[PDB]
């Protein structure tokens, strides 16, 4: 449903962009935006971005500091 709705939205928006008055600059704006979506796949350091987002949350920034072994031992 998501892929077919995205394709139907892309086709409907490209159709309406074709019907529009400045149609060729619409279809070239699509190229100018797809170029940046291409270049973001090449530029962004996704491992460093992943670990930066891991540092954004305190639940993933540190290890769990909780129960220690010497307290809950049972001899």
């Amino acid at each position: 449903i998501a892929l077919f709705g995205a394709l139907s939205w892309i086709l409907y928006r490209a159709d309406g962009q074709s019907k529009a008055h400045e149609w060729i600059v619409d279809l070239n704006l699509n190229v100018l935006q797809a170029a940046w979506l291409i270049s973001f796949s090449s530029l962004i350091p996704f491992r460093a971005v992943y670990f930066a987002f891991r540092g954004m949350a305190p639940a993933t920034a540190s290890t769990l500091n909780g129960l220690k072994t010497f307290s809950s031992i049972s001899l």
Binding site: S41, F46, R47, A48, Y50, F51, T63
Partner: protein, 52 residues
């Protein structure tokens, strides 16, 4: 190790992180590597009973 567990996580199976390894961002310490080796050695419970 924590880096090996991150490599086996779903997040490093996703498309933008297929070829990445978590050791390259933060490598495990010498204590963490020797403790992973020690825990793999103690995963046999009979070996843990004999060692203790």
């Amino acid at each position: 190790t924590f880096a090996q567990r991150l490599n086996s996580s779903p997040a490093f199976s996703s498309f933008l992180l297929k070829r990445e390894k978590a050791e390259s961002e933060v490598p495990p310490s010498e204590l963490e590597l020797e403790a992973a080796q020690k825990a793999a050695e103690l995963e046999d419970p009979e070996v843990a009973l004999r060692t203790l």
